[PDB]
């Protein structure tokens, strides 16, 4: 049971790097692998959780 | 097909918040929902990807 059906399926391993000096006030990062704005959250987690009963959600990095 | 079988299954929605002033040099955050050090990566993604063919990996936040 894989988790990612959408993001860079050609890649062997998806690791994203961000510098704190690009966060601004705050940024929300996707942990559900469904965002169309990867690696940022775009709210797609909500439909996923409703359909599946899951409870996943983003990481908020703040300043 | 839910993604999270491990983290706070009582919770309706798992949103984590971190302040950049707690990153230090860098921190790696789990996006595979298998870490025993949630919300940080503990390398559990590697066994998951080997078993399933998946390609998920952490978010690295650096300074
Ligand atoms: S779109 Fe994936 S966690 Fe929000
Ligand atoms: S342990 Fe989950 S992304 Fe590394």
UniProtKB/TrEMBL annotation, chains A, B:
Superkingdom in the source lineage: Eukaryota
Keyword check for Acetylation: no
GO cellular component terms given for this protein: endoplasmic reticulum membrane; mitochondrial outer membrane
Amino-acid positions noted as binding [2Fe-2S] cluster in the UniProt annotation, renumbered to this chain: 30-32, 41-42, 44-45
Part of the intact protein present: 69 to 131 of 134
Organism: Caenorhabditis elegans
Full protein name: CDGSH iron-sulfur domain-containing protein 2 homologue
UniProt-annotated location(s): Endoplasmic reticulum membrane
Principal location: endoplasmic reticulum
């Amino acid at each position: 049971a894989r988790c990612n059906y959408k993001i860079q399926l050609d890649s062997n391993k998806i690791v994203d790097t961000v510098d704190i000096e690009d966060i601004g006030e705050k940024k929300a990062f996707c942990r559900c692998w469904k965002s169309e704005k990867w690696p940022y959250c775009d709210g797609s987690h909500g439909k996923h959780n409703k359909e599946t009963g899951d409870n996943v959600g983003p990481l908020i990095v703040k300043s």
